Design a protein around this ligand. Structure first.
Ligand SMILES: [Cu+]
Length: 105
């Protein structure tokens, strides 16, 4: 795999980690749709709105299987720690028009 998952379920925005690289989900978009990080960094998405959102990477992107993240309710968060360089496209499962990528260097 190309990422590890600190928590399989979402958690409160209040508990996002120090050194957290945060992508807000607001106005029905990933507010940083193209994010550049380093190997070993943890990215945390935080849903700011009432509509649920997730992050979903199809099979072959973060690993052999698709990574369909859990649905984040308002003011919840979800993290991925990227362990290998690459370009990792994702979308929101319920809203496939909502797309982003993480580029890991
Ligand atoms: Cu969404």
């Amino acid at each position: 795999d190309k990422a590890t998952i600190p928590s399989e379920s979402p958690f409160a925005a209040a508990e996002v980690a120090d050194g957290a690289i945060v992508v807000d989900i607001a106005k029905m978009k990933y507010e940083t749709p193209e994010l550049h990080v380093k190997v070993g960094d943890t990215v945390t998405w935080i849903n700011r709105e009432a509509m649920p959102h997730n992050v979903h990477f199809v099979a072959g992107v973060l690993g052999e299987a698709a990574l369909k993240g859990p649905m984040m309710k308002k003011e919840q968060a979800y993290s991925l720690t990227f362990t290998e360089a690459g370009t990792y496209d994702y979308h929101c499962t319920p809203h496939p028009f909502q797309r982003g990528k993480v580029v890991v260097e």
